[PDB]
Design a protein around this nucleic acid. Structure first.
Ligand SMILES: [Mn+2]
Length: 1498
RNA sequence: GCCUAGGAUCCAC
RNA sequence: GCGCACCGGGGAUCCUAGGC
């Protein structure tokens, strides 16, 4: 099902023929195996001659450790003017490098009424009851202050104060004097305006009105105020005088916005040792308060707190937000003034001092250190323990430890971007160090453009550590030190994957995308859907030029790192592929056959175009773009730049003129100014259905509308809470909507609207209400509509793959979506299909270091790309060598690399530079128009090649969309530079390219060139080309020398193992081996494969897709996995976060990470949950695992281990029964009596009957009472919206099958959302309700027979006697009989894994201690279904679920038992875990920890 | 400019 | 003390009516 082009018209006229005849000009794909050898010998002779003479550069250098170390030392010798640094001096100046670091190592160190009043007012404000219009927060602060006054007069509860400021309702920290003066002014002005009443009276009345309105609104939605233990006695008849006469003396908090001198730090600088963990604990608390600084709602402000430019100097705190955090003997307040995630200025303040240190920061970057105060210490301890027995270093081990700790603390404190590329490039350095040859242009690629002082200090520390490890007299254990330095390098993963700045990264990415095209020689700009003849001529010219490359037979010789491919070498490659020369013997037998003889359902944000007429828009509108740019600069100046400058400034007057235009003459700017004026005037004149505002047409009480909006924004429509509104309001709203003919016909079907009609007529008032909401839900004065303008300038629109795919499927009525459909093309042209030329859209992934760009096309583009991808994949599958998809080939490559390193043979661990942009679809078209697969069959191969040619032709003429952000930024920069503001006179090539089109009209929207291959688009075609070219290169090398090479590659990589011949050659004659490597480089360049300067040749290591291998030992990437586990949390249900962390940690332990650290990672995750006020269930995580629990067991085995650890002596009498039960089920006794009489029956009364059915003693009466609290027992928790989702008690297995058959937030924002959910009515009642977790805790504490129990790790489980099992069935419904769930899971694993798990576990205690070195590994294999196997076996035990859930989503003798044993489980994934996530089959563990893992004998 | 009544904004994005 | 494509981020009030 590939060839389907015969349904369309060809229309290939005089252009496709030209491109075809281009790649047949000077190419001879018929050379025999002898002419090819002769030409290769000639080329090699000429190359060796011209390399000895010196007409060609060296390009490779033999490794000299001394020279490499010297270059790394003098890598940054223009600012770091030094060579050797004293370790003590480095330590000394580390603890003073920055505010955060100064604070980390400094020498520092009641149930009152104010808390009640503050919580009450916070709840009142959260509901958005009272419209803040005239200093409402002022009387809020007045109430809080009165509460505090009464409180202190009672017993002097000196909390909630900061010397002279107190914490207000939301989070605000207001000063006493300022609010006192404000109350004075307000009472005075009010008394004057209303003038008889005393000031005390006029204040108490103002308090009473607000309190009365708040209490009345609260006693309307069942939030009765008696819950909050408030006391309205605090409103004393003598209060105003009590306030004005109250005064607390202390300090005044401050925030410093400028770089303060290093003497105002009120504590001793360095007292904390690096060995201790107190610095990590301080960083943990500070990072926690910094992430919490994002949960503050953006309330209005009372006072301006400063005036004029002094508002960016040292600023006193009269009204600012404040987050508290404690340090082990004291408390501190992180004070700030802005709310959100954007970068802002914080300041730490104490109670006995003020403004300890202020610093700018970005809150959503400090997550990796939240509770990892003991994980990181153990990481450093293990890394030090690696190189600990090296006798050349034992004299100065403490310095190595100090440097490692300092590097970690530093990268955690300041997670800057360019402080990550340094630690990344350290890997390439240490790789080239131990090798034998490397690229001469290496050091010029390790240099990162460092900026701040902290980055230079980090470089200094790294340099000291390197020169301490890789010395010239430490030739003891190179493998351990290599692994140590590699892990130090991989420490870069501890920073973040995110981007510090969106626009700057998206512009650097566009510069990377645009520069090579401009430097190549030609670029088409703003192409039309019907390509112009000149554009076709330029494409043909660029085509004929792309083959014009030459080298080593010319005057100038070769020119390296320039895109293109020589006709001679392309002809050699095609001929050698047609002569069977590039065919191993295991492939000439099975002759190569041409491959001509829901699926996209994802969340890739596929693109979709806009249509203004019959044609679609392909160019931004110049006038609209400049209008939007000016509209942006207006908000930038008014909202922000107002309190920044004076008014006599030229730039200020120009910006204010532009603002008045939206809301000089002697420089040539008045002309352009009036042009912009008339343009924006035309735009404003040109800019002069159901929705949310329809709620205004229905609900009279605006407060109810505010509640509805708050719900809709906090939670999705589906989990809308019932008790947020009065019951009668639902029916009233439904009636009022249905009566309004307009809204009735806009939301109901009188002929989803059908569902609204049904639910209304059925009197399902809440259902009708939620349906209506779902249909609906889907500052400065502007003289026009700003949002429609902003959304009209854009050209493309993103969405989900599934949405557009379903729309296309509905419009059809894989290949069925692009050829047989109502919106199908008729006559594909030369450029592209009849629909129009292919179109992509630039993006970029978030990758450590640099960021690769991802192309995104619309549906037709994705389909036509997938056709070529599948064709070339099925083609490459016949040939051996590629490892992009074939996992078996990758494992073979790993085995070959291991064998090669074991023999100390030469290994070339290559990599290619700019593989994406340099490759081009024309190259693939040329290399495809010359191969012949089927030597005999020459009938259908021609048709297949013609089809693939006509597809690659379209892919050649593709047009890439320039992102809207970068074009807007360039337009604003152009406007500014036209005004003359900030003349730079540099004008990088990108800016020149943009301006050259801006100042002549048209704006660059779509760019098309012959040069770029979509990075990640043709990922398999490029892989096939790389395979077929590397095979020819190795064939040439074998033809010249007398050795062989075995190469593996996945589309950008190369691991080339050399035979013994090449190794002994490099041993004897270094010159010949070097010129061979150089000729290999030359060849790879001649075929458009530019070897990257990050490639090495050595006999010590071998990397492939970041999988290093040394002799004997194996190198784990400890810090990589630890950093991947530290920040890997989301805003999801806790039993899913736990499963994700468990999978991550399993993958980790399968790669050499010790378990003593994985336990600490799990403890950190549990602490992160405990902080969010969530109870810990036994089915969450087992933080006491061993080695066996990851190699033998699986997800559900460590759970059994944990439960056994919780309740010993009770699970034993259950395994005793389970052994006999498994024996009976395996011999084939019943196999159905159990699966029906006990799996579809009661729980405990059935459990005792089941265990007495066999010949074992039933459990004691005081064992069935052990139960665990299962929140979400009726319905899963309602999660607060952190991502817009694109468009009964269902068992978890059913939802897993649904997921398989078919814009999120950052990590820190996700953790904030998680902490916001748990504590905001997340649980759901039996039928439909909402309760706080604390309310359920209270309801459980009421019953004086329920006993809680907690383990040392903090796992909760309860003891509920049997007499309480009834009567009060409102809460007991949430408990589950732990023992029975343990039995169920144990049985579900005993038939998943072997029957061993039912044995009696015993710890190996007869084993004495061995002298365990921290580096000696042990390889192990795990102790060893499908999708339709489950779905064809589920309609037998629960056919109603099929008829209800799984039907529209379209034999094993024991799967029918397991697939039902997990349905009634509803406690943990049992078969879902093996159907959704594949277990790894190769583990590398510590041979010392295996000595302590338990034994589970049958 | 100030005061009063009402309307708008008052998780993160 | 953030970002560091030299361009960004770093303090929230607004509207209608009436009275002085
Ligand atoms: Mn590689």
């Amino acid at each position: 099902g590939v060839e389907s082009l015969n349904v369309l018209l060809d229309n290939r006229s005089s252009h496709y023929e030209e491109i075809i005849a281009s790649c047949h000009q000077g190419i001879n794909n018929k050379l025999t195996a002898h002419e090819v050898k002769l030409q290769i010998e000639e080329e090699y002779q000429v190359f060796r001659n011209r390399l000895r003479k010196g007409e060609i550069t060296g390009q490779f250098l033999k490794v000299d450790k001394s020279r490499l170390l010297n270059d790394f030392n003098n890598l940054y010798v223009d600012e770091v003017t030094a060579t050797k640094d004293n370790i003590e001096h480095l330590i000394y100046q580390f603890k003073r490098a920055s505010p955060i670091l100064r604070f980390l190592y400094a020498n520092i160190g009641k149930e009152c009424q104010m808390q009640y009043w503050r919580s009450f007012l916070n709840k009142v404000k959260s509901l958005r009851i009272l419209n803040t219009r005239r200093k409402l927060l002022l009387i809020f602060d007045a109430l809080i202050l009165l509460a505090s006054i009464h409180d202190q007069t009672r017993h002097k509860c000196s909390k909630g104060w900061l010397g002279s400021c107190f914490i207000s309702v939301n989070d605000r920290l207001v000063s006493l004097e300022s609010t006192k003066r404000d109350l004075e002014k307000w009472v005075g002005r009010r008394q004057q305006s209303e003038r008889p009443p005393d000031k005390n009276q006029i204040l108490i009345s103002m308090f009473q009105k607000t309190i009365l309105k708040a209490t009345a609104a609260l006693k309307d939605v069942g939030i009765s105020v008696e819950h909050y233990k408030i006391n309205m006695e605090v409103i004393c008849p003598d209060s105003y005088d009590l306030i004005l006469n109250f005064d607390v003396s202390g300090v005044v908090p401050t925030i410093s916005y400028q770089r303060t001198e290093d003497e105002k730090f009120p504590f001793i600088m360095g007292g904390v040792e690096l060995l201790e963990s107190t610095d990590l604990e301080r960083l943990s608390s500070l990072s926690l308060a910094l992430v919490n600084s994002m949960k503050t709602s953006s309330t209005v402000k009372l006072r301006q707190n400063e005036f004029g430019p002094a508002r960016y100097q040292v600023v006193r705190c009269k009204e600012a937000y404040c987050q508290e955090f404690l340090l082990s003997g004291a408390e501190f307040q992180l004070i700030y003034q802005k709310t959100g995630e954007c970068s802002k200025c914080y300041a730490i303040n104490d109670n006995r001092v003020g403004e300890i240190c202020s610093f700018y920061a970005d809150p959503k970057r400090y997550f990796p250190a939240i509770f990892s105060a003991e994980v990181l210490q153990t990481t450093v301890s293990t890394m030090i323990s690696w190189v600990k027995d090296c006798s050349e270093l034992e004299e100065q081990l403490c310095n190595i430890n100090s440097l490692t700790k300092m590097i970690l603390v530093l990268i955690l404190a300041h997670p800057s971007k360019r402080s990550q590329k340094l630690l990344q490039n350290l890997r390439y350095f240490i790789m080239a160090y131990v090798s034998d040859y490397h690229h001469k242009d290496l050091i010029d690629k390790l240099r990162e453009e460092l900026i701040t002082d902290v980055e230079f200090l980090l470089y200094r520390l790294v340099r000291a550590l390197v020169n301490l490890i890789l010395s010239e007299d430490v030739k003891s254990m190179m493998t351990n030190r290599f692994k140590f330095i590699l892990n130090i390098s991989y420490m870069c993963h501890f920073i973040t994957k995110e981007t510090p700045d969106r626009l700057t990264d998206q512009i650097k990415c566009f510069e990377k995308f645009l520069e090579p095209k401009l430097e190549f020689g030609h670029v088409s700009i703003n192409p039309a859907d019907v390509a112009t003849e000149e554009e076709l001529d330029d494409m043909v010219y660029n085509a004929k030029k792309f083959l014009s490359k030459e080298g080593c037979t010319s005057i100038k010789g070769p020119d390296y790192k320039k895109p293109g491919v020589s006709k001679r070498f392309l002809s050699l490659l095609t001929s050698s592929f047609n002569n069977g020369s590039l065919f191993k013997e295991s492939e000439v037998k099975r002759e190569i056959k041409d491959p001509l003889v829901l699926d996209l359902a994802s969340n890739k944000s596929v693109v979709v175009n806009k249509y203004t007429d019959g044609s679609r828009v392909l160019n931004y509108d110049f006038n609209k773009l400049t209008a939007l740019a000016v509209s942006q600069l207006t908000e930038v100046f008014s909202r922000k730049g107002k309190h920044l400058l004076n008014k006599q400034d030229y730039d200020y007057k120009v910006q204010q003129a532009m603002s008045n235009l939206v809301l000089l003459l002697d420089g040539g700017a008045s002309v352009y100014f009036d042009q912009l004026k008339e343009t924006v005037e035309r735009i404003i004149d040109q800019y002069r259905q159901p929705s949310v505002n329809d709620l205004d047409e229905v609900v009279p009480n605006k407060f109810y509308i505010r509640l509805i909006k708050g719900e809709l924004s906090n939670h999705m429509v589906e989990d809308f809470d019932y008790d947020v509104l009065p019951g009668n309001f639902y029916e009233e709203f439904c009636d009022a909507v249905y009566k309004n003919n307009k809204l009735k016909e806009r939301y109901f079907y009188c002929g989803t609207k059908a569902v609204a009609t049904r639910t209304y007529f059925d009197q399902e008032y809440f259902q009708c209400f939620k349906s209506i909401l779902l249909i609906m839900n889907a500052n400065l004065n502007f003289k026009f509509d700003m949002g429609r303008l902003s959304d009209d300038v854009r050209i493309s629109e993103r969405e989900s793959n599934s949405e557009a795919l379903s729309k296309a499927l509905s419009l059809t009525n894989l290949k069925n979506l692009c050829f047989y459909s109502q919106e199908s093309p008729q006559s594909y042209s030369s450029t592209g299909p009849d629909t129009g030329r292919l179109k992509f859209s630039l993006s970029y992934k978030e990758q450590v270091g640099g960021n690769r760009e991802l192309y995104i096309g619309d549906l037709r583009t994705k389909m036509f790309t997938r056709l070529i991808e599948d064709y070339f994949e099925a083609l490459s599958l016949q040939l051996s060598g590629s490892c992009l998809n074939n996992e078996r080939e990758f494992e073979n490559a790993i085995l070959s690399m291991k064998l090669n390193v074991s023999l100390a043979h030469v290994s070339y661990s290559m990599d290619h530079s700019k593989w994406g942009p340099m490759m081009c679809p024309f190259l693939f078209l040329a290399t495809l128009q010359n191969l012949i697969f089927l030597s005999k069959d020459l009938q259908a191969d021609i048709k297949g090649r013609d089809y693939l040619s006509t597809l690659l032709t379209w892919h050649m003429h593709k047009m890439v969309e320039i992102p809207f952000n970068v074009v807007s930024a360039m337009m604003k920069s152009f406007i500014k530079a036209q005004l003359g503001l900030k003349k730079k006179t540099t004008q990088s090539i990108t800016e020149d390219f943009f301006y050259s089109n801006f100042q002549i009209g048209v704006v660059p929207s779509h760019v098309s060139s012959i040069l770029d291959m979509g990075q990640g688009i043709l990922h398999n075609t490029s892989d096939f080309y790389a395979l077929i070219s590397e095979r020819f290169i190795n064939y040439a090398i074998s033809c010249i020398c007398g050795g062989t090479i075995d190469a593996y590659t996945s589309s950008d990589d190369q691991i080339s193992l050399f035979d013994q011949v090449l190794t002994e050659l490099m041993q004897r004659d270094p010159e010949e081996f070097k010129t061979l490597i150089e000729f290999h480089y030359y060849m790879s360049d001649q075929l458009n494969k530019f070897v990257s300067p990050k490639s090495v040749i050595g006999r010590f290591v071998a990397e492939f897709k970041s999988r290093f291998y040394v002799w004997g030992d194996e190198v784990p990437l400890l810090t990589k996995f630890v950093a991947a586990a530290l920040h890997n949390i989301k805003c999801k249900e806790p039993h899913q976060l736990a499963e994700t962390i468990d999978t991550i940690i399993d993958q980790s332990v399968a790669n050499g990470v010790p378990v003593h650290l994985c336990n600490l990672i799990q403890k950190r995750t549990l602490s992160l949950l405990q902080y969010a006020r969530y109870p810990i269930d036994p089915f969450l995580l087992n933080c006491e695992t061993d080695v066996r629990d990851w190699v033998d067991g699986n997800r559900s085995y460590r759970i059994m281990r944990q439960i056994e650890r919780l309740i010993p002596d009770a699970c034993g009498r259950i395994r005793s029964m389970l052994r006999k039960l498994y024996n009976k089920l395996k011999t084939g006794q019943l196999h159905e009596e159990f699966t029906t009489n006990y799996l579809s029956s009661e729980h405990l009364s059935s459990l005792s009957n089941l265990c007495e059915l066999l010949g074992v003693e039933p459990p004691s009466e005081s064992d069935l009472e052990f139960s665990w609290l299962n929140l979400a027992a009726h319905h899963p928790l309602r999660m607060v919206l952190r991502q817009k989702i694109i468009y009964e008690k269902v068992p978890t297995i059913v939802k897993t099958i649904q997921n398989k058959l078919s814009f999120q937030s950052s990590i820190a924002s996700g953790f904030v959302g998680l902490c916001r959910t748990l504590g905001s009515k997340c649980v759901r009642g039996p039928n439909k309700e909402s309760l706080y977790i604390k309310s359920i805790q209270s309801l459980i504490s009421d019953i004086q027979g329920i006993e809680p129990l907690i383990d040392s790790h903090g796992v909760q489980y309860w003891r509920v006697p049997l007499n309480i099992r009834d009567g009060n069935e409102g809460v007991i419904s949430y408990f589950r009989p732990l023992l029975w769930d343990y039995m169920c899971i144990s049985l579900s694993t005993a038939i998943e894994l072997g029957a061993w798990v039912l044995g009696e576990p015993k710890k190996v205690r007869v084993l004495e201690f061995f002298k365990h070195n921290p580096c000696d590994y042990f390889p192990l294999k795990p102790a060893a279904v499908g999708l339709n196997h489950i779905i064809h076996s589920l309609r037998r035990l629960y056919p109603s679920v099929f008829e209800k859930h799984i039907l529209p989503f379209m034999r094993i003798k024991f799967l029918d038992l397991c697939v039902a044993l997990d349905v009634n489980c509803e406690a943990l994934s049992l078969v879902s875990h093996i159907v959704k996530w594949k277990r790894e089959e190769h583990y590398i563990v510590l041979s010392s920890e295996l000595r302590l893992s338990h034994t589970r004998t049958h």
